[PDB]
Amino acid sequence: TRAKAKTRSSRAGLQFPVGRVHRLLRKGNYAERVGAGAPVYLAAVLEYLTAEILE
DNA sequence: GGATGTATATATCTGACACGTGCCTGGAGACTAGGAAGTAATCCCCTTGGCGGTTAAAACGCGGGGGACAGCGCGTACGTGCGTTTAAGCGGTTGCTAGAGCTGTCTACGACCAATTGAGCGGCCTCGGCACCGGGATTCTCCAGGGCGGC
């Protein structure tokens, strides 16, 4: 009985994809392990910088 | 006749070679899975050598004046030197704490795998808005009749 799946971006209240950023961090040869909050934080920072330049 | 310059020998200092030891990290051997090489098909972009026509950019010439450069004067601000001060540099005290290193335990967090499903990509239908065509309302130019003048 799986629950209703929701995205990690909606959990973090973001528009940038947390899962895509996590996959690019895991396959980008940056470290052996990637923490859970690191793609959330990096997606938030990227979304903020995009918001500043777009405004 | 006395003391000085110089040569050879002996003890000591110092960098380098080899011996010893730990240990831990690289190498040898075996197994396995998947990354990448190779193959075939399809489709679109790039190459080389041409042609035609438009047209705006490039090239050329010439006059002239603005700006780069040289020279000169001048005055000020920086170099130079000396005497004095001062603070850097070294050595030293005295405790406490931060941090590297090592060892040990444990637990939460992230890798991994299977099933699922819902967000991303493409096309299709519809609406908002812009545009094409038909019909009604308003204003401008014109042709003809009436009256007056001349022989």
Q: Is residue A8 exposed (0-12), middle (13-18) or buried (19+ Cβ within 10 Å)?
A: middle
Quote the CA–CA distance of A18 and A24 in Å, as a whole number: 10
Question: How many residues belong to chain A?
Answer: 55
**Nearest nt by C1' to A15 Cα:** B119
Quote the CA–CA distance of A34 and A25 in Å, as a whole number: 7
Integer distance in angstroms from CA A41 to C1' B95? 45
Quote the CA–CA distance of A42 and A37 in Å, as a whole number: 9
**Nearest nt by C1' to A33 Cα:** B110
Task: Cite residues whose beta carbon is less than 7 Å from strand B.
Answer: A 2, 4-5, 7, 9, 17, 26, 32-37
Quote the CA–CA distance of A16 and A20 in Å, as a whole number: 9
Q: What would you report as the CA-atom Rg of chain A, rounded to the nearest whole angstrom?
A: 13
